[PDB]
Amino acid sequence: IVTQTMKGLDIQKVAGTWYSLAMAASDISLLDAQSAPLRVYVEELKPTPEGDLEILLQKWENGECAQKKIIAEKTKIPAVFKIDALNENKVLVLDTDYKKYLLFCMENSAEPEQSLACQCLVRTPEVDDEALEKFDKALKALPMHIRLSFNPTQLEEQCHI
């Protein structure tokens, strides 16, 4: 479903601390409650020397903020990664300047809109209107139905509480 990817991505560069400024899904159910499936908060991006992508995040599970560790396996396309799991899901980097923001999404193969969510990652706990612009632009086509956004205070909180 996602048609924009970042040309000439340097995945090494995207390493470090990240803030999930905003999130969007094609289904309200994926983001509605705090225990919603794709409602995850990114701690840091950790690209492996063989070009894989270790992702650190938090996610509410059974009344508690629990840090999680996911691994995105590199594919032929530099901006597309596969999360080693059921139903196979892709991780697409849409766009990034490495030092300010990063836009990427997650779509479940064989069923886009019935599985798809995007985030706007920023380096600091500052809201970046510039980045939000790019994020909305990119999503302007996508069939999104829920949209979230956090404030500097929630961003310094675990699970953006």
Ligand X SMILES: CC1=C(/C=C/C(C)=C/C=C/C(C)=C/CO)C(C)(C)CCC1
Taking CB under 6 A as the binding criterion, the range among 54-62, 93-101, 138-146, 150-158 that sits at the site for ligand X is 54-62
Taking CB under 6 A as the rule, does residue 92 contact ligand X? no
Q: What are phi and psi of 101, to 5 degrees?
A: -135, 175
Q: Which of 49, 76, 110, 140 binds its own copies (CB under 8 A)?
A: 110
By CB under 8 A, what part of segment 39-98 binds its own copies?
62, 69, 84-89
Q: State the binding partner of 156 from ligand X, its own copies, none, CB within 5 to 8 A by kind.
A: none
Instruction: Please state, in angstroms and rounded to a whole number, the distance separating the CA atoms of residues 55 and 52.
Output: 10
Instruction: Please state, in angstroms and rounded to a whole number, the distance separating the CA atoms of residues 135 and 23.
Output: 9
Q: State the binding partner of 59 from ligand X, its own copies, none, CB within 5 to 8 A by kind.
A: ligand X
In terms of DSSP H, where are the helices of the chain?
Answer: 129-139, 152-155
CB nearer to ligand X: pick between 57 and 138: 57
Q: State the binding partner of 92 from its own copies, ligand X, none, CB within 5 to 8 A by kind.
A: none
Q: Which of 26, 58, 96, 119 binds ligand X (CB under 6 A)?
A: 119
Q: How far is CA 86 from the centre of its chain?
A: 18
Q: Which of 22, 55, 79, 131 binds ligand X (CB under 6 A)?
A: 55
Q: Which of 68, 70, 75, 69 is nearest to 51 (CA)?
A: 75
Is residue 121 within 8 Å of 104, Cβ to Cβ? yes
Instruction: Please state, in angstroms and rounded to a whole number, the distance separating the CA atoms of residues 26 and 47.
Output: 27
Which residues contribute to the site for ligand X (CB under 6 A)? 38, 40, 55, 57, 59, 68, 70, 83, 91, 104, 106, 117, 119
Which residues contribute to the site for its own copies (CB under 8 A)? 30, 37-38, 62, 69, 84-89, 108, 110-111, 114-115
